[PDB]
Design a protein around this nucleic acid. Structure first.
Ligand SMILES: [Mg+2]
Ligand SMILES: [Mg+2]
Length: 132
RNA sequence: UCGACA
DNA sequence: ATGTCG
């Protein structure tokens, strides 16, 4: 039940919170579609969030109806609810990560999309293809 | 309390 | 250990 005609996104971080990054790829070819420039500091869940919303953008501007695979239970939800509920403090250091996270919001609720966002069954299918 | 996904 | 959710 793996829909290979999809986009699988995942985040790679160093410490949580800390240096964060994500990337989307073709669930099958493993081809790297979009990659995020390593952010200074940010939580994992925010990483996931952005990873998804970015992929959401990527598709819409290519007119793709491919669903999205994320193993972030927290983000898949945040996104469904168009609301990132991150408890990370807002200070000049968590600037960029919060800047982005907000724009991802300003987008979610100012756009349309039927793009399915699906949970990747890591326990049954192994690490997601966009994994580091 | 724990459980779950990262 | 921390980030989040149920
Ligand atoms: Mg992940
Ligand atoms: Mg991973």
């Amino acid at each position: 039940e793996i829909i290979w005609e999809s986009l699988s996104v995942d985040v790679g971080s160093q410490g949580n919170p800390g240096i964060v990054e994500y990337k989307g790829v073709d669930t099958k070819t493993g081809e790297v579609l979009f990659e995020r420039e390593p952010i200074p500091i940010g939580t994992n869940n925010m990483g996931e969030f952005l990873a998804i919303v970015h992929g959401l953008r990527y598709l819409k501007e290519r007119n793709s109806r491919k669903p999205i695979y994320s193993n972030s239970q927290t983000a898949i939800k945040w996104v469904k609810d168009k609301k990132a509920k991150s408890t990370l403090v807002r200070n000049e250091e968590t600037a960029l990560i919060w800047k982005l996270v907000d724009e991802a919001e300003e987008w979610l609720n100012t756009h349309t999309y039927e793009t399915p966002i699906l949970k990747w069954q890591t326990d049954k299918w192994g690490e997601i293809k966009a994994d580091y």
